[PDB]
Design a protein around this ligand. Structure first.
Ligand SMILES: [Mg+2]
Length: 329
């Protein structure tokens, strides 16, 4: 199997520096400029100051007061993402989109050597957009994405089999990639930190992790991945018939669901509210709207509407929100 993983370098910030010459070479931090704003991404200059994604923006401003701080120009970024994925599909149809800036390609049945292929991705992308892309090459998805993130800025790295876990030993498991930021500490707490300390030495998905650390993944590049539903629910602390607290939950659900839609590059037209009542029954009601929606407050408005005209007969112990009837590709 010949697996390539592509990953744009500081995507939003690089787009901003490409569209604004006067921002080049300087720290650029793209994110939410309001109160609880969070860094979406920042250029490699800015990372030298200690800024990283998900960091609160007021901190980033403290670390880098002279930095250029920008809001998220979502639609411009999606433009550039489409003109990159076009090259990706032109190279081969076996493309598994991961995100607005990440794909896998299964080039096992392509003539050119994977190294030449990655070189062509790089060239084609920088000619089309001015941006650099880090490319990984291996026989796996796990390894190919390790290789793409490795020589991260404008990188290119092959990982063949001979370098089965030997080269992975010094990796901090923070960079596990495979499944991290959920065992950031329950492994730093139980004393092992390097893949070395865990190399073939909780989540009950360890059969992935212990296998992934080896050269073994086997999961296929999945073209044609279709999401039918996206949702969130919460079992409640106590039973309730108070539409007000139910709707606060719906509000927070709307935010989560909006974020997942936006990340998936999708829109929705049906909103579903779900309750579990005190006699263990599940009730759902949905509304369909004419115009595609993706914004947290739009989803929330439909959901709030649904809840208000429900007439709860029994006490509620679970509340959930769901979106379906999704936009294409
Ligand atoms: Mg990226």
């Amino acid at each position: 199997r010949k697996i390539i993983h592509v990953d744009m370098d500081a995507f939003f910030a690089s787009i901003e520096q490409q569209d604004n010459p006067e921002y080049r070479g300087k720290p650029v931090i793209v994110g939410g400029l309001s109160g609880r704003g969070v860094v979406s991404t920042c250029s490699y200059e800015a990372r030298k100051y200690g800024i990283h994604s998900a960091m609160p923006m007021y901190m980033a401003k403290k670390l880098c007061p002279q930095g250029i701080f920008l809001p998220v120009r979502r639609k411009r970024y999606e433009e550039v993402s489409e003109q990159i994925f076009r090259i990706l599909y032109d190279i081969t149809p076996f493309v598994e989109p991961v995100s607005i800036d990440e794909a896998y390609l299964d080039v096992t049945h392509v003539d050119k050597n994977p190294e030449d292929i990655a070189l062509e991705i790089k060239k084609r992308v920088k000619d089309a957009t001015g941006l650099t892309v880090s490319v990984g090459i291996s026989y796996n998805k796990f390894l190919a994405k390790l290789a793409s993130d490795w020589n991260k800025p404008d990188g290119l790295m092959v990982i063949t089999e001979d370098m089965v876990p030997e080269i992975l030993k010094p990796l901090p498991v923070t960079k596990v990639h495979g499944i991290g930021e959920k065992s950031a500490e329950k492994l730093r707490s139980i004393g092992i930190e390097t893949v070395e300390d865990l190399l073939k030495l909780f989540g009950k998905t360890g059969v992935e992790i212990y296998n992934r650390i080896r050269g073994i993944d086997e999961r296929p590049v999945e073209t044609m991945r279709e999401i039918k539903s996206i949702g969130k629910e919460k079992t409640l602390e106590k039973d309730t018939k108070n539409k007000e607290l139910l709707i606060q939950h719906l509000k927070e659900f709307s935010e989560i669901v909006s974020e997942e839609l936006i990340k998936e590059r999708l829109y929705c037209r049906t909103v579903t509210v779900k309750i579990k009542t005190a006699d263990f029954a599940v009730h759902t009601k949905s509304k369909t709207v004419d115009k595609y929606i993706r914004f947290s407050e739009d989803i929330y408005e439909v959901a709030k509407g649904i809840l208000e005209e429900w007439k709860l007969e029994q006490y509620v112990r679970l509340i959930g929100l769901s979106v379906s009837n999704l936009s294409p590709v």
